[PDB]
Structures are given as C-alpha cells and as structure tokens.
Curated annotation (Swiss-Prot):
Protein species of origin: Homo sapiens
Amino acids binding Fe cation: H182, E184, H270
Protein name: Lysine-specific demethylase 4D
A Gene Ontology BP annotation from the UniProt entry: positive regulation of double-strand break repair via nonhomologous end joining
Its biological purpose: Histone demethylase that specifically demethylates 'Lys-9' of histone H3, thereby playing a central role in histone code. Does not demethylate histone H3 'Lys-4', H3 'Lys-27', H3 'Lys-36' nor H4 'Lys-20'. Demethylates both di- and trimethylated H3 'Lys-9' residue, while it has no activity on monomethylated residues. Demethylation of Lys residue generates formaldehyde and succinate.
Positions spanned in the full protein: 11 to 341 of 523
PTM notes: Ubiquitinated via 'Lys-63'-linked ubiquitin chains. Deubiquitinated by USP14 with the help of TRIM14 leading to stabilization.
Domain called JmjC: residue spans: 136-302
Amino acid sequence: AQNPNCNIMIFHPTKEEFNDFDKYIAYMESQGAHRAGLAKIIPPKEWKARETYDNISEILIATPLQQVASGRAGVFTQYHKKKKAMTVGEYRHLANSKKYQTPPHQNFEDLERKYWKNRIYNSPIYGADISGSLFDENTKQWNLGHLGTIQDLLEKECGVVIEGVNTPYLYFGMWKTTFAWHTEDMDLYSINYLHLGEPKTWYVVPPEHGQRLERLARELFPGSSRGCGAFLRHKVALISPTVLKENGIPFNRITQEAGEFMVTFPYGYHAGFNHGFNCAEAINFATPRWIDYGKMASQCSCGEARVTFSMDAFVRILQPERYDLWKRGQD
Ligand SMILES: O=C(O)CNC(=O)C(=O)O
Ligand SMILES: [Mg+2]
Ligand code: NI
Ligand SMILES: [Zn+2]
C-alpha cells in the first residue's frame, strides 16, 4: 500500500505531465497521495496562471464576512457577520491596516503559534465564496475555470444526465481569516490555487480516519451535535493542532504559498488560516473514485448547511433514500 502513514505528498509535474489533469490526479493517487486527504502540486516553472495581478482591485466583494469567534483558544466556533460591500483594493488596504495586518514574526511556525494563541480575540474579515476566476483564458493547463464538470463525470460513470453547473470561487483573505473543519459538499475533491499574496496554512485528517475527527467534534461541541447529526457541514467549528494531538487524532499540516496548488481528496477533513492578504481560487471536482464517497456522504438536513443548486441532483441520484429529508432542510 502506497503512503501508509498518510503523509502529505508534494508533486513537481513537468510541463508535459501538466497537460492532462485527470491523468495527473490518477498518478498522484497511484503513489498514495489521497491517503493524506491533501496534496501539494508545484506547477512547472514554464507555467503561469495569468500575466499579472496588477489589475484586480476593482473586483467587488459584495458580502465581506467578519469571522467572530466563541469558545476557547483551541476549541471555538465562528459565525459570519455580513459587512458592507467593498472592492478588492479597499479590502487589501483594510488587510494591511494596523488593526488587521500580520504581526511581526520569525517564521511560519512562530506565526502558527500566534494564530492559535490569539485568533479568538480578533474578528478578521474574509472575502469568501465569490463566483469568478483569475485564470487567463489562454492558460490551458490546470485552469480551474476549464475543468471537466462533476455533472459530466456523473454522466460518464453512471449514465444519468443531470442539471447543474460547476464554477470556481475566489477567496480574498487577511491575517487570521479561517476555514473551519469540513469535507467538501458530497465529499467531492477540491482544488485550490493561491494566486497571490501571503500563505495559507492547512490542517488535514486522512480520509480513513475522518470518523475519529467527527467523534471528537461531537464531544467538543455537544449542543451542536444534538442539533444536527452532520454539524461539521455547517463549517463553523475549529479545533487546534494541540487539541487534536491531546486526543490522539491523526492529522498533518502544510503551508501553501503563492503559485502553488492544493488538492483535497474525498472525505479529507481540512481546516486552516491565512497569513495575511491573499487571493485563492478553488473549485470542486470529481473522478471515478469519488462516486463511492458521494454515495456515502453525510448530510445536514437541519437547515443550517444550505448549499448550491447543483447538489440537488447529486443527492437525488446518489442518495435517493436521503433525498426527501435533505430537500426539506434546503426548503
Ligand atoms: O481557502 C479557503 O478558505 C477554504 N478552501 C477550501 O476549503 C478548499 O479549497 O477546499
Ligand atoms: Mg479589477
Ligand atoms: Ni474545502
Ligand atoms: Zn445541520
């Protein structure tokens, strides 16, 4: 069995290997990359996402989200308070202000220490989940707006034609902006490209051990767990590495820098934080190996998780027994 300790693997494809996206994902899996839940892909030196980022300041962040924490430093939830619209240039200036800017630090480890010590005492503003793309249309390799769609994959594997679309999302971050512990919708893959700015630190639980994280989460968030049998779908709970280690939960960590891709694999729980002003692009995708994960994915039916249009068909076809309850949660 390849990668039996479930380490995060880092790949350096050549420009030739960068042509065929599906083939390279399958390659990475042949080497055991999926066992970690997360892999890093460093693009060949010849590749670029676009020519420059000099002209992005007029993108609008219609609903910036202030991420307000409750709990203790290592075990907390966050809720998202909506803020007034602002442009990317206005948000960058805000991220760089004395109130929000990254503190002086020695290295990524010192910054990570400071994040876990101090995150809860601040409320950073995240421009998350913005439909759009920063890939140039002429970028033909690993262009996250030109991937094969999940609907087409389901149709190719299973023969059933379904409605829905699959487009990327932009994320504008600042120091301490946080992504809570989650797997993707329908336990899909994700791919995330850090276009510019400061790094993003990731934490991940191997898919084979995801239920250990869920059991810890039920213990640590007992009211939330009574409310919903899949409350991590709400994407609000944080647990620090120190707490994970104290509870024996297997995990790994890595820091993504600008110019690098990360892939999350089906049922790979992940969480993390931004180091400072940055911009990432991410999209969900599927492969043949995903189908079995999609069929088994948990679902929130309490009403909190509220998701895209396109998830309807995935539930309806892959999980017909759960469909009626899940759809009630949506309505
Ligand atoms: O970058 C973020 O805030 C969150 N991204 C992801 O969870 C992902 O790419 O799967
Ligand atoms: Mg612009
Ligand atoms: Ni994710
Ligand atoms: Zn729920």
